Design a protein around this ligand. Structure first.
Ligand SMILES: Nc1nc2c(ncn2[C@@H]2O[C@H](COP(=O)(O)OP(=O)(O)OP(=O)(O)O)[C@@H](O)[C@H]2O)c(=O)[nH]1
Ligand SMILES: Nc1nc2c(ncn2[C@@H]2O[C@H](COP(=O)(O)OP(=O)(O)OP(=O)(O)O)[C@@H](O)[C@H]2O)c(=O)[nH]1
Ligand SMILES: Nc1nc2c(ncn2[C@@H]2O[C@H](COP(=O)(O)OP(=O)(O)O)[C@@H](O)[C@H]2O)c(=O)[nH]1
Ligand SMILES: Nc1nc2c(ncn2[C@@H]2O[C@H](COP(=O)(O)OP(=O)(O)O)[C@@H](O)[C@H]2O)c(=O)[nH]1
Ligand SMILES: [Mg+2]
Ligand SMILES: [Mg+2]
Lengths: 100, 430, 427, 430, 427
């Protein structure tokens, strides 16, 4: 209706001989066939009913650390002959013993 | 291989075929020129040098309809033999197109059909389109089927006809052509599908996003049903249905040969993106009276046959869920002697769309064919229309001079009455 | 050694047989190109049971494909394991099957019968140790219902001593894929009762029930259904191919399960069956297998044994298990459920053990039994057929092929005799 | 999983629904386009891809109100089939909206509601909104309940209507519409709640800090009450209450369903900064005669039903102390027939605030649903108003000329009189 | 060894069950994923009592979850310990019960009963020796009361020998959550009197009071309220789960405490209970536990026993203790309280010792006793039931489900008889 009016409108859509035309928004022209299925065949449970018994059931280890046993460290420090506090730490800082 | 042949008589039949061969060319990926930029053997013949030819012959008594294809973009595909046309139409007269003019060109049509039959290794049926109200469609089709019945005998003869609308009528002498043609089909046709224009107009106005459609829109909807029907043979499927399997399941009686057609989903260009279109949803949409291609209420009768063909993304498991849910509906009545009721077929090919088309682009669609007593209501309207004008003998002299013997009119009238009595008797539980 | 010949008389059987040979090739380790690539010497022990060896190491199955239209063969030939079959072991007609029993049996049946019997003779005469025939068909179809019984009658005339064991799919109770199936099953059973030795009944809706309940398959395909059927079929012949501490061949299974010539219809069932995610929660043991085998939710046939009583039943176990628990469990299950068994047959159940379980299972079991619950299945088709009796008009479609109406009365009288036979053996 | 469905009739119903679905989208985090930037299945359905749809249908006899939603920003979320618009309204005439015009479209609406319920597996209940003064709301509501009662049988039918105000009114023929509507819902409705605009205006002015409210602010208050009621069905809580629980608890008989509602706190977004509003604080505010949205005197109205739905932040011990403290008050007299008289719902979900709104950002809030004999006060006012006009036969000719029989007026008058007699009998001690 | 099957009904049952299995997992030392990460071999002696073992070193608890709506089911699944429960153990409907006892029993109880019974039988016959059933339910009306009593009868029909020990939370008789409680409670008691063996009554108000008085919780949260009930539950079965100097199972408790078949309702209590701060200063000994156990503020049933009289009393202990100290304390309390005991029963107090105490506490105890103080609870609900039946309000919902009011009269007649039996037995 450009011969009488300046038109920029959506709701009151005029018809056209071939088809009514769009008011909402749409994805690309040809695209989107609707609501696909999904499938999971019999074979996978054949595999899992065996392999569930296998390795993937292995438990997790512990992230241990080499924390010093200070008492045994002092035993070795005394045995080596470290007397002064600074030299005591030097042996205590370097030559660890991890706790049993 | 296995082959099908398509024959068209009348303006409507050819224009419906024009839509169908568009749909098939795109579906298989065949350019209009016949070259490629599969399963061609089901409908096409590989002539060598990359060109293909359809298995169809067009015959119209006037050249206007056929000249449209001759001057159109379609011309490079069809063999010039397959574009037969006369120079004088029957002009809405059954007697004129069956005796005075039909016998002039019927031998030419039969020879070309037989020439096409030589190349069909696995010929197992024919597709013929009629316009019941037309003089050319009814008269020439009657002579063609009677001749083809004795030419080949035990071969499936499936028809796709257009019934006159309950109120919309384009021909004044339409019932005269309708009854005489119906009397001739009823003895030869294996099974004739039934559609009407008025139901197509109402469906396209409500469901599809078209306000004032044309004949192109109606033909494309019919063409999709043809493609869905023929998809079982053309492509691999979980449940393939043969043409003869349709013959055994769809018409479980002697002469009851008129089922109705339905198609789902029929949705606009934007509501599909707004909707689930689940297997249960589309199945429920089929049985609702608003979605039928024939304007007859199933609540006036009962069902005795159903055939569902699923094209696309469809698990068989949901198919069993859908049909079981349908049987729970009290609004749908099934006769006692048909406990099975249904034939299902599942094919993996998705629906086909057309550039500048009318439909959505869905991932699953279902074509439905059902034989029911609701079609008996249409016969009552046709019979009453015929009786009113024939009582005053409204158009007898036009037919009589054109080769019609007056004794044939009561014979066809009695034949229609026998059809109505047969339809009513079957609907009675025993 | 102890050979079997497998006939796929129907298009459905060609699909089921296709999946079946995938299962057998997987079990024995046959590569998709026909060359053996297994992992154990025990596979090659009795490979002669199901396969012939061609010069070059290529192994070819003893299978024949039969159909009236070429639709299904194209799918199988293009299939993953379509190469394995013999190129000359494809027999197909050039006409529509039409889903019609009379048309398939008479019109195209006589045309193809002469050729198909000649092709079968290639496998029949080329195996010295032959004891077995395996027919796969559907009862509601057009090429397995009619032509399958045609082959069954001809083969019985040819080789009376060999066992004729067939597998059949029965039309579903609620809704089945074709309108005219009750007629097709009615005509088929008359030939099957007299000719066949062993009949296995499987229902599609029961397969759907098992998949949704136990496996929790939210979208079970045809492949899943065929796999379950192939599992039961493969387990039955396991005694013929592998060592076992208590063997049970086909003749053993026939003698134990069949008390009288006409009551030989069998229900099938396989264990273990578990949800894909719940298998880790299961302590798979013999009592668990016994619970699943006798569970009323695992049979592939939709017939409740609790509504009737039990005839002789059999169980076959695959996997490394000891005997004693198997003997104790079967003894306890018999003593626990006295009312469901029959007193005039002491030791109603039979047991068997095979050494090697199927791939992917550390042990599995196969259940085959016979009971009076089959009468409900016959009642379904009989009640439908009785209203189809008023559609003896509809039978005009059958007489157009050449059938006479009195055959249908002969067949229904046979079911009536069979139904009364089951009722009187209930007492 | 578990589902609800809502219908809105009349401009009052549609405009209320507009605000409610605003509130749900912000609560559930859904853009107006239906795409996300759970408990969705209770109210929304997933249409595939990335778009959602609401379980609502909007029906009216005039296109203006429906077209506003079609023109609004939220036009994208709703499905076009859900928006049903009539041609000409009932013109505040019950007879016109029930028989002459209502029957024209009633079959169309009934098809869409039943069709939407097909996707609605775990469904118990419906939400229907009415304008008692308006002819379409009362007239179409009667017919819709009449059809839904027999089509679905034992299903929870719950309604949220606007009762006529004791003095504020906009239609002169309002009493005629209300009495005839009351005669229909008294048999076809399981349980329906009512509020009046006069008390809504008063509460929106005193406790809330709006000098001059519009219909939008009142709709937002109604939406908050609806959101609290449906909170249990969507989120976990220490005490979850289902629809069937409400029906069993609130009513002691068949015809005494009508409850009253209350919501606390209703403090404004500005004044709320000063108060912590503990469990004891909010509990006491509910029972104030001023906090009721129905202008009824609690002194004349004994209590024999109560329901405490707490949203936000609560520990169950504080409820038990608060309930016990409330029971000690002498002014709040329960009936002898109801010692326990309490249902309480403790739900973890805090309330929601709308941008550009009016309510406070309260950490915890409580909604009240109770049945009291004070509602019998409103019936007498409506009964007397009807008697004054019908004494001189004020507007008989309009309703008679629209297909309604004259004798229906005394029938509904006697039906209301029985209701008032039942209320007096039940309120009496024994 | 000696197994027990655990059943949880409705909202209240599942939340308590979730807390109970959290406590049990802590006791035995089972990781929430199912792996055993305990510290004592003594946990493994009787792990079979409450657990089945799945292959792969995973344990599945003997818990069956039952509901009519999935709301509570989803909450348990999302819970911390929801992974332990077997997926198939979850049985639920698709309908909010509405707490109509007639609806929950006839309308929806019957259809779910068939599925639940078979699921129960799955675990019932999977144990070496079943001894008793454990049921947790609330007396609301929808599923815990209606469906709970229905399952109790069916289990009584199935297993007359086994002990049907049920735990009941009576509606709190000053503030409670629905108006239809007296109807549902009266019918539930009617069914529980005849078919149940041991009924444990717990009041929410007393649970609030204990948290304030002894635990000094600022707000008793439903997690901790369920924790105390779970602790009492574990102490009851602790004698079976671990050794002790003087054992006492469920059957021992029932025989000792119950003098006559009808009077078998029990009040429960726990000790030691201490605030989070003052536990450092407490000198916990046998006299301290005795004082807490017989304290009127630690009994979690809101019916003061001092108003009535006692009939039987039982005491459990957990931890290494001197048996003489326990024997002296029980004699000490018995002679002091002689005005609160029946003259015709000497030695009214039972004792028992368990070797291993609960985690965190060096010492623990559990009190269970029977008294005539239950006359108050029945009288209160009877008066409420009398009013509502006199007005005949709220009955239309129950009538629509098919329950006729003559059933209400029978239930009150039984309740009045129970009140009378307690009254004359007080003399
Ligand atoms: N669905 C559909 N129907 C059509 C179309 N075109 C025509 N028809 C119908 O088919 C009928 C054709 O009959 P006629 O108009 O008589 O043309 P004819 O078949 O050649 O018969 P005569 O020309 O009279 O000899 C018309 O009456 C229409 O109702 C079409 O494009 N689509
Ligand atoms: N609270 C509230 N009430 C409204 C609103 N709009 C209308 N109403 C009420 O609706 C009544 C008027 O009737 P309508 O809303 O027109 O009801 P109707 O179904 O459209 O009936 P008719 O218009 O007469 O055909 C008045 O009494 C108002 O109280 C609104 O936005 N908010
Ligand atoms: N389980 C299963 N059934 C099938 C399959 N293919 C076809 N059928 C069944 O076979 C029936 C059709 O019968 P038909 O194929 O003519 O039998 P046939 O001649 O023996 O192959 C249908 O109703 C299907 O239910 C399949 O792959 N799996
Ligand atoms: N102690 C305790 N009681 C609870 C809890 N949750 C709910 N309840 C009580 O359980 C009752 C509801 O029981 P319900 O599960 O609905 O039984 P049903 O109606 O028969 O199915 C209410 O009265 C609550 O007071 C909890 O976590 N702890
Ligand atoms: Mg024409
Ligand atoms: Mg209006």
């Amino acid at each position: 209706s450009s011969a009488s009016s300046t038109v920029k409108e959506r709701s009151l859509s005029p018809p056209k001989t071939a088809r009514r035309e769009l008011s909402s928004i749409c994805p690309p022209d040809y695209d989107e066939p609707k609501t696909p299925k999904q499938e999971r065949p019999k074979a996978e449970m054949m595999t899992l009913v065996e392999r569930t018994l296998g390795a993937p059931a292995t438990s997790r280890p512990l992230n241990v650390k080499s924390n010093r046993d200070f008492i045994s460290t002092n035993k070795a420090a005394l045995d080596a002959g470290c007397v002064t506090a600074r030299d005591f730490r030097e042996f205590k800082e370097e030559n660890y013993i991890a706790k049993k | 291989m296995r082959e099908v042949i398509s024959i068209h008589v009348g303006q409507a039949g050819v224009q419906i075929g024009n839509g169908c061969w568009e749909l098939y060319c795109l579906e298989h990926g065949i350019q209009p020129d016949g070259q490629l930029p599969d399963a061609f053997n089901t409908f096409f013949s590989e002539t060598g040098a990359g060109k293909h030819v359809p298995r169809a012959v067009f015959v119209d008594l006037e050249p206007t309809v056929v000249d449209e294809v001759r001057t159109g973009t379609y011309r490079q595909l069809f063999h010039p033999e397959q574009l037969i046309s006369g120079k004088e139409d029957a002009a809405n007269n059954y007697a004129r197109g069956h005796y005075t003019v039909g016998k002039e060109i019927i031998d030419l049509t039969l020879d070309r059909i037989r020439k096409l039959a030589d190349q069909c290794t696995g010929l197992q049926g024919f597709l013929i389109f009629h316009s019941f109200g037309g003089g050319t469609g009814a008269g020439f089709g009657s002579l063609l089927l009677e001749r083809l019945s004795v030419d080949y005998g035990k071969k499936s003869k499936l028809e796709f006809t257009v019934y006159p609308s309950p109120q919309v009528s384009t021909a004044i002498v339409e019932p005269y052509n309708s009854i005489l043609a119906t009397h001739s089909m009823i003895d030869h046709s294996d099974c004739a599908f039934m559609v009407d224009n008025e139901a197509l107009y109402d469906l396209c106005r409500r469901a599809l996003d078209i306000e004032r459609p044309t004949y192109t829109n109606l033909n494309r909807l019919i063409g999709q049903v043809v493609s869905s029907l023929t998809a079982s043979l053309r492509f691999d499927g979980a449940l393939n249905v043969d043409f003869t399997e349709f013959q055994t399941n769809l018409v479980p009686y002697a002469r009851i040969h008129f089922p109705i057609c339905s198609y789902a989903p029929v949705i606009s260009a934007e509501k599909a993106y707004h909707e689930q279109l689940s297997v249960a949803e589309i199945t429920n949409s089929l049985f609702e009276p608003a979605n039928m291609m024939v304007k007859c209420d199933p609540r006036h009768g009962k069902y005795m046959a159903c055939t569902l063909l699923y094209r696309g993304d469809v698990v068989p498991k949901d198919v069993s869920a859908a049909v079981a849910t349908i049987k729970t509906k009290r609004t749908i009545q099934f006769v006692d002697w048909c406990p099975t009721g249904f034939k299902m077929g599942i094919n993996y090919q998705p629906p086909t769309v057309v550039p500048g088309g009318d439909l959505a682009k869905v991932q699953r669609a279902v074509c439905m064919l059902a034989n029911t007593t609701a079609i008996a209501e249409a016969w009552s309207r046709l019979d009453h229309k015929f009786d009113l004008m024939y009582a005053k003998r409204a158009f007898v002299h036009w037919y009589v001079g054109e080769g019609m013997e007056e004794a044939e009119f009561p014979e066809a009238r009695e034949d229609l009455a026998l059809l109505e009595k047969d339809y009513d008797e079957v609907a009675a539980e025993s | 050694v102890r050979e079997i010949v497998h006939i796929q008389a129907g298009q459905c059987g060609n699909q089921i047989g296709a999946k079946f040979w995938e299962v057998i090739s997987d079990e024995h380790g046959i590569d998709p190109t026909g060359s053996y690539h297994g992992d154990s010497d025990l596979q090659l022990e009795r490979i002669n049971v199901y396969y012939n060896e061609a010069t070059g190491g290529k192994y070819v199955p003893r299978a024949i494909l039969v159909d009236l239209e070429p639709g299904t063969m194209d799918s199988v030939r293009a299939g993953q394991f379509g190469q394995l079959f013999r190129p000359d072991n494809f027999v197909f007609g050039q006409s529509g099957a039409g889903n019609n029993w009379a048309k398939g049996y008479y019109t195209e049946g006589q045309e193809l019968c002469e050729s198909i019997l000649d092709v079968i003779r290639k496998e029949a005469e080329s195996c010295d140790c032959l004891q077995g025939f395996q027919l796969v068909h559907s009862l509601g179809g057009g090429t397995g219902a009619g032509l399958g019984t045609l082959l069954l009658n001809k083969l019985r005339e040819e080789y009376p001593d060999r066992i004729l064991s067939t597998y059949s799919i029965v039309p579903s109770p609620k809704v089945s894929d074709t309108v005219v199936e009750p007629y097709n099953c009615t005509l088929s059973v008359h030939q099957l009762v007299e000719s066949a030795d062993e009949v296995f009944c499987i229902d599609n809706e029961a397969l759907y029930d098992i998949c949704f309940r136990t496996l929790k398959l939210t979208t079970p395909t045809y492949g899943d259904l065929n796999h379950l059927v192939s599992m039961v079929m493969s387990g039955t012949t396991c005694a013929l191919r592998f060592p076992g501490q208590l063997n049970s061949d086909l003749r053993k299974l026939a003698v134990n399960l069949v008390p009288f010539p006409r009551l030989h219809f069998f229900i099938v069932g396989f264990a273990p069956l578990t949800s894909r995610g719940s298998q880790q929660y299961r302590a798979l043991t013999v009592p668990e297998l016994t619970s699943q085998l006798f569970d009323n939710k695992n049979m592939m046939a939709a017939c409740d044994p609790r509504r009737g009583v039990y005839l002789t039943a059999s169980a076959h176990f695959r996997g490394r298990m000891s005997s004693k628990e198997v003997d104790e469990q079967m003894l306890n299950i018999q003593a626990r459920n006295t009312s469901y068994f029959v007193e005039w047959i002491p030791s109603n159940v039979k047991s068997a053990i095979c050494d090697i379980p199927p791939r992917g299972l550390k042990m599995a079991a196969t259940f085959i039994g016979n009971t009076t619950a089959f009468r409900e299945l016959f009642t379904r088709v009989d009640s439908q057929f009785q209203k189809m009796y008023a559609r003896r008009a509809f039978i005009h479609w059958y007489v157009n092929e050449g059938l006479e109406t009195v055959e249908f009365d002969e067949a229904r009288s046979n079911m009536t005799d069979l139904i009364q036979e089951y009722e009187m053996y209930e007492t």
